[model samples]
Every structure is written in C-alpha cells, then in structure tokens.
Target: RLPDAPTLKRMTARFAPVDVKVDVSKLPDAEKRALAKILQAAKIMDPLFLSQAWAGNPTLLLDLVEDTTPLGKERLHAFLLNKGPWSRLDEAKPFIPGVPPKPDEGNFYPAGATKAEVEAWVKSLPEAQQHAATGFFTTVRKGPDGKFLTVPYSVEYQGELGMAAKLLREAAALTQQSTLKRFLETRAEAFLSNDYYASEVAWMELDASVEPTIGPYEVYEDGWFNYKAAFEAFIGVRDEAETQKLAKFSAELQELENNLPIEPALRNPKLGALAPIRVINSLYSSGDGNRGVQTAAYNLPNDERVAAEKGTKRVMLKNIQEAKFQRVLVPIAKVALPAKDRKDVSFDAFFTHILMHELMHGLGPHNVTVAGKQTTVRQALQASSSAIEEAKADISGLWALQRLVDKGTLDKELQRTMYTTFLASAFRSIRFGIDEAHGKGIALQLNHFLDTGAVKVNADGTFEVVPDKMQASVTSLTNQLMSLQAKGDRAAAEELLAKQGVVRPSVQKVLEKLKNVPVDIEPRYVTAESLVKDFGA
Candidate 1:
C-alpha cells in the first residue's frame, strides 16, 4: 500500500534529486550514433528491472495513483524512483496498501516458496539436472505438477529481451570501435541464447572511449541462495586519461594477493589476465545498477570461469561518486566526524577508497579449493557471500592503501584522509539499513573497527580515528574475512555477520540527527533526448 499523505511527506523527505551530466562532446560522431542506439536498448531494461524488482505489474503504479491528489502524484514518482511499492532504504517496508513485505529472494523465485523446499527439490534432482534450478541465469518456479523448475532469462523475458537485442545489433552496426562492435554483437546474441561468456570476454578486450555494458549480472538481489543474477546495464563513456593512470595499479594484484594475511595455501597465485580500471561518466543506468543505493563502482565478470581464465574489469563511476560526495557524504561528515577531523576528510581520499575497494575485489580468492572440493567463494558462503565479499573488499582495500603508503607509492597525507573519509562513509552507508549488502558490510566493518579500537566516539558524538590502531584493525579484519572465505565456512560467515553487522546506537543517533540530509542522490540524466537528436535517431 502507498503511504498516506503524512507518511509520504516523511518518507519522501529522505531523497534529493541531482542532474547527472551526460558528456559526449569528446566522443566521435560514430560513437554518438552508437550511444543513441544503446540508450534505446537500455530503456528496455527499465521495465525489465521493475519486473525483477516487483514482478512487472503496471497496476502497482496505477494503484499508487488511486487518488488524483498532490500526495498521490508524489507517491507515484516515489514508486518510480524506487521501482516498487516498498521504500528501498527503509528496510524495503511497503509504502502501498496490499503489498506484502519485499521478499528477500525478491521475484527470483515463485511466490510463497521456502528455502527448504527449493533445496529439497535440488537434492532430489539427477546430478545433471541439479543446477537447472540454481544457476545464475534462471528463475525458479513450480511446474504444473507442483515440482520446482528453472526458466531461462531468455524465455522468461522473451519480448523485452528480443527488443533489447535488436537495439544492441543496431548499436553494434553504428559503433566504429572493433572491440565495442564485437562486444555489442555478441552481447546481443547473448540476450537470446543466454550464453554470455563470449560477450563477457569481448567486453574485457574493449579499449574504447565510449562503452555500453548490459547483461544479467550480479546476484545481490537474490537473498535466498545468492545464486540468481539480476539484470543490469551501464551506458557510459570511459575517461581514458584517468583510466591510463589507474592501470598502473592493475599490475600489483599478484603482489597484493601474495601478501594476503591468509595462509599461502589459500592465496590464488594465478590472478586474472586483464585487470583494467576505467573511470566512467554514465549517461544512463537501470535494473540492478539503479537500485536502492547506487553503486559508486563495481568489479565484474562474476563468473568464476571467466575470472579464472581472463580476470575482471573495475569501473569507477566518477560523476556518480561526485554527486554522492557533494550531496550525501559531505553532509554526513559534517555531523559524524569531529570538528577538528573534518579537514582530514578529502574527496580525493574518498575516491581512492572506492577505487581500491574495487581493486581488492579483483585481488581476492575467486576460485579456490576447500575441503578437497573445488568451488568459488560465492558458492561456499551461499546467501552470506555478497555481504562477506563486500566487507573483504572494503577492509582489505584499506589495508592495501596502507601498504602503498608504506611503500612510498602513495602520498602520506592520504593516511589521515583515508581514515577520516572511511569513518564518514560508515555513517553514509549504514543508513541504507542492514538489508542492503553494502549497508550490512559497512555495519560489520564499523562494529569491528570499534571493537578493535581503530576508532572511538568523541564525547560530543563525533568520531576520532586512532591512526596506529586503525591500521592494525584493518589488517585484523581483513585476515578474519579472508580466512572465512578460504575455508568456505558458511557457519562462521553467518555468525560474524549476525554479530557485527548492525548500526550501533552512537552511529544511529547521528543518523537520527541528520534526518533532513538526503540519504542518496536520485540521478536525473541531463542528456537523454539530446543524444537521439544529435545522432539523428
């Protein structure tokens, strides 16, 4: 059910809109044409995302406009922002009447199905048929005879996906870059065949200033088994100069992995082939990318096979990060960090932290052996994998930053700024609530940092980082997380998550005080129609 007038007023207060610039002046005419075609394809993901979000019923939006008052309009717009009937930041609580609680598994599974029931069905399957229900590209549903079955993304989203594939082929023809054309063409085929490996490999080899990333990737939304992937798309231009500079760090992955706090037996020596980093100015995003808490950056090719064979790519969304820093993090710091320490919180440090977080994701255990069995960390930890993996990336990234400083590869001033900026980020992310992977991961880090005395709450409710202690605590937590992943210890992962993944009262009070601060920026792309006009679409 949609919120009543008064509740809508309070709930909608949490967000502020920022127009994200879509810069294409530097892109060539051919690239511009490609962008227009890609955007058409990307638009198809909007409804597809809503389907995955809440089963794709337009009636949900219609129902929100039940009354034609100002409040009704407000509720409708809010529903569009969140893509469902629930408030994404408020633990996914229903804002409209008649909608039940947002399920952890979301619409990935048949309604009312239990975890035990699905697991039992999987167990009863022949070895060859087992993965049919649990694979990344399938949706689980009960058959006519009441047995569980899997449906491919292609079959499930046939109509919209078919249109998206056609647009992608059009974009491929318009693209001048060979790698980009190859990627787009193969990715278009992937939309129909559900074989994304060749396209994923093509995407890695792309070396263009303009880029378009779309696919069924990332399983964070499938809280049930973390096995089902959500559809997502990112259409943007790469910042070539920034990318060249960041590429220097890609070579250090093996050294970083070698120095992991976990045992040598657990470390993966054979790192992925191409670990490239690119900073992007996104023109549009939808599906999982546009969900509740917008991602600042991501390291992808989550397929363990691709990761084992060819490595992964890390993309940092510079414009989105800027919006978040200006609108959210800066304000959060004003209230959460001590007056004296505020000077130490730099946007550069914040950006560096985010970049390193994605880098650490590429450096961790992707494919490994546990208990004489072969599996990826994701499969081992199951439902808890996303949260644990996020925590590992964060803490280990900080640890890696410290290492760079120690090696004189990074500036010393970053030490204070990193600590302060990270402390400020805790408050910023935890507000998303523990249900979100990033939120839960950050909460776990905050609790661990406090427990390890890395930081202490000031007498006046602000935070002060104890530099030496903070350094040690980063390593400590990294070691703990790495050991859990190496052993494939689901029980330990669940226990630690339950124990430390919560917003403490001190942090909660600050969040309460900043009730007027925007939880996150809702991006409004400034150049959607302009691309079509300029490209003669």
Candidate 2:
C-alpha cells in the first residue's frame, strides 16, 4: 500500500535538507556578536553531547562524509548511533536491518541500569551528595577511581567547555552591545564552572534584534532521572514587527494564571513570575534538542528560583513551527483526519496551540507535595514529572486562553485558532514515539479524548472532534491533574499515567493506516548557518 520505489526515491530527494541563505545586515552589532559566540560554542559543545548520548563523535559525522548530497547529509545526521534513518514510520527501521529504535535511557548510563538500581545508589550516597542525585545540570555519577561519585558538568566536559569559552570570548570582543557582551563573557565563565544562573539572568533581560540563547535546556534526555539538561542554542533575528503586535498579550500571563480551574493552593502562588511572550524564528539548534524535534515554543530559565524572582521568557519559535505544519502536519491531517473536517487544519490554529502550551507551564502546582507531607513537585514526581508537567501545560494553556476570551480581551478569531489547531497539533506531537516525554503526553491526550468520546472514529478510520464532548473532557482532565499534583501522590500519578498515557487501540489502527507520515521534523542549522553568513558578511 506504500508508494512505489521510484516515488519513494523522488519524495526522499524533495525532503532532503536544504541550506538556506539569510542576510543579517540589519542586525545590531551586539546581536551579531551574541550569535557568533553561541555558534562557536555550540559547534564544539554539540559534539560532546553526541559523544555522551549516543557514544558517537560529532566531528566524525562532519569529517567522514566526503560528498555533501542533501540526502546523504540528512541520513548521516539522523542516525547519531550509526543505527539508521530515524524511523520512516512505514517499514520498521529503514536502514537498521532489525534494530528497534534505541532504548529510552540512551547511552548515558550503563544501558542496563534500572530505576531500582539508581534509587538504591542515591539512597546509599552520603548526605552532601544528595544534591548530586537531583541537580538539573549534573551528569550521572561515575568516579575517577572506578567508583560512583556524581561528576559535575564543569569537570566532565572540561575540554569542550574550554574551547566553547574561547569562542565566546572572541565573539564578545566583537559585539557592540554592552549587555550582550557581558552575557557572552559570563556565559563562557558559566561553561567552565558549570554555573549558569548569571548567564540565564542576563539572557532574560536581553531585548535584542539578533540574539543567541544557549546552554543546557529540556531535561528529556535523562529519561530515567529527569535531572540532566541537554544543551541547545537559538540564534535568530527578533521579528520586531510581529513581536510588537504580540506584545500586549504576553502581559496578561498573571490574569491567565489567576483563573486556572484548580483549588488555589494547587495553583502556583508565583504566577506573576512568568514572563512576557515573544514569538521568534530559530536559525540554529544543537545538542540534544536537534534530531526530529521541533521546539514549537519554549518557557525559558528553568531554575525555579529564577522563575520566582525574575519571571521567565516564553518564546514562540514561529518559523520552525510553520515548517513542521506544512511538511509534517499536512500529510498527517490527510491520513488521520476525517475528510470533511480536514479543512480545519489551519496554520493559525497551530500557532495558538503551541503558544498556549507554553503559557500553561506557568499555571500548575509549582511546589511538590507527598502524602501528608510537603516535598518538591519535581522530587516527588521524579522521572514521571516531565510527562505530567507537559500534559498539564498542554491542557492548561487552552484553559488560559478561554479565560482571556471570557474576559472579552481576546479576539474570537484567536480563540477559534487555539481550539481547532490544538486538536490537530496532537497528531503532530504524538508521532514522537510514546517513550518521549512530549510524545507520551500526546498519547495521553489522544487516548483520553477517544476514551471520553470527545472524538469519534469514522468509518474510513480517520477522526472528527465532537466539540461539546471535547470541552467537557478538557475541564475534567485539567481538574484531575491539579488534584493529583496537590496530593503529590507518586503512586497515583504512576497508575494514572500507566492507564491513560499510551497509544490506544484506535490510535494504533489510525497509525497503521498513515504509516508513511513523518514522525517529526528534522531541524537544519546548516541552512541557518548559510543564511547567517550571507547576513553577517
């Protein structure tokens, strides 16, 4: 039932990566400096991530290939473990002969290390090292004398960090903006020392035309512990015109938080700590963030204290979102959506869904609770926290928008965009493989709706949303999640996730019908690089 060999070949060629050219002549001197420093640092640092995550050398990929055909580069880059093209979704693993996709833990810890073993080891560690068990930025422990002692990123990545620092210094010297210069200088220091709070604080304050934001972000890579952050960078020009139009909405975050459908204690007391949102187009992505991942939007400066004192930044990476919309979502809608309602797949909807997703992150139980005890939300949820948080954000964002609508502050067009687009976007995110945090959240949402009869299964096997059913399910699911967070009932969370957080049989049948849909979009910094060169020079 798949395309013939020739059609497959031709389709593959068209989808091969393209290098884009961007003109940066309009960028401020400071912005340019920040970008170059980020690129230089990322060039070296990304290799270190590849080395650890997949046991492969980034430089090896860059160096081994002599010819640069677009498909060749795409294939080489897609498989960091030398396994094969990331699953094409149709025929098992394209080039991996018989290998199932890589395991959830990746290669960081011993492949066989279990949750029980990790828990026991942490319990056995001395009191001072307890922080080591949960530091968001530290690598898992492995001692120099072949024993176990957590290795700080500063010591573990010294060689690469040193090189990254040098690049940052060179870039800092060239930048004309004082704040950006300070950021680069401090970031280099943070890398060498593995302390990034100052850099994050500086980054939060920057309102630049051209900006480079870097460092360890998104703890999805450490699937077992959810404690380690993977490195990534965003180098792009701030679309000032678009940003200005969107500016007013960002200021309403507090109002959005205040209206959440939860008991007040279950809501974050630090609601105002959330920052204004700025929509941006990304030029580059590195380290763990790349590879079939599309960061449709982001809520930055993950340090809770920083979030509490200095409000975080919510950036909607617009360009990346659209590319996925056109390239990935369209194909999915064709196969997964009922024919009559397929018209509902609009880009505006895509934008609102993602924007709200980021907004929702600031609304939940910011603290952790255990049965009859106070604890860190993160500490208690541990590995299960990422999916839970993402699910909360996913639904919470919609409720926030609805609150704005109810207050008559938001235009009806935007409201429609949020609802229709969010429903469609799930098809895109759920494709990420159930093991991934976001992917699991997608599965959870999709299964929940199908179970609750919020979406109907068609005779042709595609789906259509029953709006009334969906709204009721949304309210119920949101309240249930908040209650679970309030109790910090780890056992309850585990059971709930295990039961509702998976690909339902109906979804599985739909996937079988739409087997050729690409799971996620591959980001291309090489295109951004060429564009940066055209602009910078």
Candidate 3:
C-alpha cells in the first residue's frame, strides 16, 4: 500500500542522517586492509538480516531497491531503515499495501503458526530433540507431512553465511593481531558449522585496532518466545584511551550485584568477573544493529551459558553516542522539557548512563532459580523478558551510578544531570514506539517515575525530574525489576508491564510537541562502503 504524499512525508520525518566517520587513519595499513575485508563481511549481514526480519523481505527488496520513482526512492529508504514492509516506529504497522501485520513470530516460525502449536511441538519432542526447535540458532517450519521442522541458521542462511565466513577468514589472514585472527577464524568456522562456543570465547578475547562483531545475538526479533536470535553486525574502530577510562567498572560487577536491591539471600557471589568494556567509534553496522531507533551501545553474547562462563563485553559506541546526543537527545530535551529543565541535561551524564546501563546488564539476575528448578530470566519472563530486562538495565544502571557516587568512584556532582538526561532519554526512546523493547521499557520507567512523583508535569505541560523523589524511585523500581528477574516471575512481569508499560497522557502531550524533532540518527557510513569497494575480495 503506497501512502499518500504526506503519509510518506510523516514516515520519513523523524530521522536525520549523519555521516558516521570511519576513522582508519590511526589504523595501520595492515589493519585497514583487514577492516576492508571485515566491512565486506559486515555487508553480507544486510541480506542475512533482511531474511531474519521477515521471510518475504528479500523479495520485496528487489522492487524497492530498483525503483526509479521519487516516491519509490523514499519508500526504499524506509524499507531499508525498518528492514521490511512494516514501519518500526508505529508499532510495527504496515506501510506497504498487501503486507500483513508484522508477526509476533518474526518469521522465525512458519506463517500462521501459533505459540501454543510450536510449544506443543517442542513438548512432543524427546528431551534431546526439544532444543532443535526451541534454541536460538534454529527456525521453525512445517514439513511436507505437516510436522514442525527446525532449520539451523547455518543451513538456513547458508549462502550468505558461506560468503560472510569466507570474508571473515580473509580478514583474519590480513590481520596482524593474533587475538583478532583467532577470533575471525573461529567465527568463520562457527558461521559454517553453527558451533559458536569457540568463536564466542575468541570474541571475548578479541583485542584489535578494528572490532568487527557479526553473528546471531539479541533475540528481540522473535516475539513468539524470544528463543530465536537474529543476525547482526558491528564494525567499530576501538577507542583506546576512552576504553582504558571505563575498564575499572568491569571489576566492580560482583560488588554491585552484592548490593542489588533484591534480598541479600538471593544474591549470587559468582557473577562473571572478567567483564571488559570497550569504547569504540561506530564505523558501520547492519542487520539487527541498523533497525530504526539505532542502538547507542550493547552488552552482547546473549548466550547465557557464555555469559555465565566467560562474562559479557559491553561496547559503548562513542561517536554514535555523540551523534545521538547532539542530533536527537538534545532536541528531545528542548522539546520535551521546560527551558529551565533543559539546562539539566548533559552529554557527560547521558554517556555515563549508557555506560552504566551496559554494565548493569551483566550484573542482573541472568542465571537464576525459579521454585526448585534452575532457569534463566529469558525463559522465565519469555515475551516480557526484553522489556523487563531493559527496565532493569536502565533503572539499575542509575541505581549503580548513585552507588558509585556514594563509593566515591564516580563524581557526585552529575546526579541531577544524570536524572534529567535520563528523563529526556525516556522521551527520545519512547518515540521508538511502545511495542518495541526499549520503548516499552522507557514508557514503564517514565510512567512509574510520574506515579512516584519523581517526574512532574510542569505548569506548561513539559516534564521535569523531581530531584528529591528521583533516587528512592529509581532504587525501588530497580528492586522490583531485579526481584522479578531473580524469582523468574513471568506472571508478575506481564502484570507489571501491562499496567505500567504505557505512554501516559502527560508524556503523550510532550510527544505531540516533539513531532518536529528527529526521533533518531541514521549513520551514513560512506567510508564503510568505500572499504567494501576496495577490499571486498
């Protein structure tokens, strides 16, 4: 369904394009060559991602990409931006005529398949075969005889994965960094064999001038059960000096987990201790990484087993953060807050909050006990998992920042700025649509903050943080989310999410006023394309 002129106008209005610089100047010639190969591998993710986004996206892409009409050009951009016929910012609504609603299964299962059907199929399986359908690396479809069949990603995305794995190996051969080389080789093999343990280990050990992260992670796409992982890639030039500054926080995970607002008895002392933080300038990204409402940072290898055994890596994309702060967050603050409250937002606070958010992701109740059984939060909360986990990371990050301030490891002066910047971020992310994970979490936070009087609707309809009420509210919310995670309480999670996870009227009025501000930045990686051109051997 083609939109009337203004419909396309409105669809494309909220994005501002920024040229994300790919600074290979500091990288040696050898590193640059390796990066070029890596960029080629990264580009392979576009097709892989599109396929994972929707089964029919690859077919639609041909018409969209080849269209010469003016409207078609814009439509193509939106298609690429959202990765399919559906619009991401509008609750996954269809912008293209004849496209059905974006499925909760996210194409991870056969069309028209119900959750109960898939679960029943899994239930019928022997214990050994259960995970073939229920695991992260498989997709589900009915066989010729009408029985459910599981397809591994390696087999499903063979063509793209084969090319991507070859490119990774080529990059590995071009690189001088031993760790990066091992990582690339292992990752290449994993792409073919679907055995990612060796690669996951190597990725955690990976140290290099350029970081090329590509693979299956972040199961947000599979709304059916969050059991399927979508492919994603990130090409970043590591920021050495900035990374060193944040390295200290990695050592404090256990200490922070010890002080979690949950009952002390529930605390696990063996929280992964070797977590490392890397700050990088995001040079290029694709697949899950490029979806509408770009990610500022991520804590990865969502394989709970890997996370438990070897910890996680929290990567903060600094340049992307800068673009977001100047391009989006600042604008949202100006539009969503009164003039006086606008002064309270700061880039430092915003950046720090994202850093803490990533750290807290590793600190939460990831592996836990529910009743007498051993389980994880992802299984426990299921569909509500992402929203609740995002809420925990956000609020718990703030709680950790406050505790760090108390511990004198962080500056106490930025507290007001942190809360204010976080308030602005709520509006910024909520614009992403409340149906999505981050947006839903932000809505929950904003509504809860309002309910607790930590956020007040000013006389002019703008919102401001109530400084005195903010701390207690953050800690209490942190406790509630962490408790739900610790106990693996899916029922409670759904109840809380249903009641609190909404954009209230006060925020809606502000959102209305924010119509002109860009919702997010689209990083136009010119040099990344150049890299692919030069080194795509």
Candidate 4:
C-alpha cells in the first residue's frame, strides 16, 4: 500500500524542479540526429536500472496509477522520480507497502543469500572461480544443487542489452564524427559481449562535438560489496572552447600525483596521460545519471584496469553546475555561511572545486596492494569504498587547489573562496543524508573540519572557514585517505569513516532549520518531448 496523499506531498517537496535546456539549433544535422538516437538509447537504461534497483519497480509504479485515487497519480510521479518505492534521501524507507526493507545487495544477488554465506562460498572456490564470483559484471545466483553460481550481465539482461545495443548502433550510424562513431559501435558490441575495455578506450579518444556516455559503470548502488556496476547514460553537447582551456590542466595531473601526501611507493610512476576533459551542456540524462540529486560532474570508466592502463575521462556538466550554483548553493551559502564569510562563496570557486574533484579521481591509486596481493581500491574497501573515495576526492581537491595556488598555477583568491564555498556545499549535501555516498562524504569532511577547528559554527548559526587551519586539515585528511586506499586498510577505513562521517549536533540543528529549502534540483529537460515523440515509446 502506498502512503496517503499528504504524506506523499511532503516527500515530493524535497526536490525542486529546474527546467533544463540545451541549444541544439546551432548543432549540425548529424549531431542533432545522433542526439535523438542517444536519448532513445539512454531511456533503455532507465528500465535496466529500475530492474537492478528493485525487481518490482516497474510493476509497482504502474500499480500506483491503476489501483489508487487521484493523489495516487501524483505519488506515481514521485515513484518514477525516485525509480522505486523508497525515498532515496530518507534512508530508502519504503513509501509503498508490502515492500521489504531494501536489500543491502540490491537486486544484484539472490534474495536470501547472507553476506557470510556469499563470503564462505567465495572462499571455498578455486582462485579463478573466486574472481568470477566476486567480479563486477556477475550476479550471484544459486545453482540447481544449491551452490553459488555467477551470471554475467550479458546473459542476465540479454533481451534489454540486445535492444540497447541495436539502438547504440543506430546512433553510431548517424554520427558525423569518426571518434564518436567508433565509440558507439564498440560500446554497442560491449553490451552483447560484456567486454567494456574496447569501448572505454574508444571513449578516451572520442573527439565528437556531441558527447554521449552509456553503459554499466558506477557501482554505488551495489551497497553489498560495491562490485556490481549500475546501468546509466548521458547525452550532451561539448563546449569546445572551455574544453581546450581546461585541457591544459591535464599536464599538471602527474606532478600533483607525485606530490600527494601519501607514501611515494603508492604513486603510479607512469600515471599515464590525463584522460580527456570536457565541459558539456547536458541535453538529457537517464538511469543513474538522472537519479536522486543530479550530479554536476563525473570521472568515468571506473574499471581499475582501464584506469591503470589508459586513464579515464572527466566531464563537467556546465548547465547543471550553473543551475545548482544559482538555485541551491547560492541560497545554501546565504543561510549556511556567516554573513562576513559569505563573500568568499563565488560561483567560480564552486565550479573550480567541482572540476578539481573530478580530476582528483583520476590521480588516486586505482590499483592498490592488500596483504601482499594486488587489488583495486573498490574490491578491498568493499561497501565502504564509495563514501571513502568521495571524501578523498573532496579533500584532495582542496589540497590540490591550495598547492596550485601556492605554485602560481591557479588564482590566489581560490585559496580562500574554495574553503568557504566548500563549507556551504557540505551543508547542502548532508541535507540529502549521509546514507548516500556524496552526502556521507560531505558529512565526513564537515565533522573532520569542525573537529580540527578548520570550520567554526558561530553563535548566530553561521559558518566561518579558518583558512590556515582548513588547509592543514585538508592536507591531513588527504594523506589519511590516500594511505587508507594505498594499504587497502578496511579496518582503518571503517574506523575513520565511523569517526568522521557524521552530522554533529550543531550541524543537525541548522539542518532542521533548513527544512523548507529544497535539498537539490530535479531536472525538466526541454528536449524530452521531442525525443519521446521521435525515437521513444
């Protein structure tokens, strides 16, 4: 049973809608055609993500419409927005009845398997079997004999994957850019074969005026052990000039990696070239890309193998970033920052922080050593990986920013504004709850900073950033996190996360006051109707 009308209304109030538009009139005919096909392909990822999130999500959404009152229609919209019956910001508590508490493993594992059971099964297997069982593309299932078996995503979602692949090929055929065509064609093949490396390599070399990202990539949703990738896609137009300007920063990645506060042995001597960096105007997003709390930027090809070999691509969603700054962060700073300190929170500072954060993901140790064996950070840290990695990015971004400023590579004003804007951004993030990785990361940074006197909560409910102390704290936290990843110290990861990733009483009091402020923006894209009419159901 779904919650009543008023209850649903309150749940929906947490997200404010912002109309999103990308000016495609200036784009070439071929790019425009490619965009439509890309959007169509992206929509296929929605149902795929829905299936991965919860087996019954699609049926449950339809039930809300067919079985309830007029208010049920509104509730159905909310259900679709969240992609399931659970409230993402509210600890994923079920808003619909008869649904059990969301499984820790999500729909990626057999419903009745316990973590200990899976672990024991894996331990009993041969080394090769263990690798297959714990791999990212496989779902754990029980064989007829009741032993565990691993199923690849290609076989698991065969029909949908085939359909999506067909769409990708169609889109590839419409692309004028050779690089884009190669990427799409190879990615389409990856869907059927469950071999993504070729596509990821193609994506690195992709020089299309129009950018499209698609596939099973992020593992954030697989809370069980963080090994399963989630289906997602995005379509955007590249900002050519801005991309060229930012491409210069790629030259600095190796230098920054060498100077990280961690042990020298952990650094990759040949960190490879920095992957391509682009600023894009997002035309559409789907699946994980359009999920709760819109993302402003991302660094992708989360595969440690791809990252170790050829690096990964970084994309900043320019319109999304600007929208968040104007609607969410600006208002958040007004209420969260002390009146005197608020001047330091500028859009450029916020943008700079985000760009640095994405780039830092590429600079860190993707492949790490644990117990004298090789492993990716994701495998070693398990469920705690996302939060820990996100926090690392945040602190490392600040650390890198300060160093660049000191070296005269970046503007000196960034040294101050990044600190203050970061303070305000922390509050905005925690409103979404520390349960999600980004929010959890924000909470960790906030509590750690406050404890170190890097940030002060004033008598009047404002925040002040202590510049010198804040920089010291950033360096300390960055080293702590990098060392954790380098050593693959799960125990230390859990311990440090337990201590730092929390909303303190003072912060909680202010959060309670912000009940009416929209926690984040919900997007309403202008291209949605045309895409649906032309290429979709």
Best by lDDT: 3
TM-score of 3: 0.97
Q: Across residues 1-537, which tens digit of lDDT does each residue of candidate 3 receive?
A: 567546776777677888887677777778888998888888878778888878888788887777768777877888888888888898877777677788778778876789998888888988568756677898888889888898889998898899989988998898999999999999999998988888988888877878878999988998878889988888998999999998888877889988888898878788765687888888899999898888889998888888888888999999989988998899888878889888889998999999999989887688887778666889778889999999989999999998888888888878668898999989988998998898999899988888899989987888888889999999999998988888899999999989998988888998998888888877899889887677555
Kindly report which residue stretches of model 1 are placed more than 4 angstroms away from their true locations once superposed. Answer: 65-67, 370-372, 533-536
Report the C-alpha lDDT of model 1 over 171-274, residue by residue, as the tens digit.
88988899889998999999899888889889988888876778888988787789988888888888887777788888888899899988788788789778
lDDT of 1: 0.84
Error (Å) of candidate 3 at residue 443 is: 0.8
**Which residue pairs collide in model 4, if any?**
none
Which pairs of residues collide in model 3?
Answer: 1-96, 1-97
lDDT of 2: 0.67
- Model 4: which ten-residue window has the lowest total lDDT? 528-537
Instruction: Write model 2 residue lDDT over 1-537, tens digit each, in one string.
Output: 233345444434333353423456777655564576667676664676566555433444555365366545544544542222334333223432233454445444543466677678777887567766567666665555545556677777788888888888877777777777787788889988887878877777667665677777777666676767777776666777777776777678776666567777665555544366676767776666454455667888766656667777778777777787887788888888777767777887677767777877765676564656444666677778788888888877677666666777666676545555666667767666676678778778777787898877888877878887777788778887777776776777788789887887777787776556655555556646654464333
Alpha-carbon TM-score of each model against the true structure: 0.96, 0.86, 0.97, 0.97
Error of 1 at 50 (Å): 1.0
Residue-pair clash count for candidate 3: 2
**On lDDT, who's better, 1 or 2?**
1
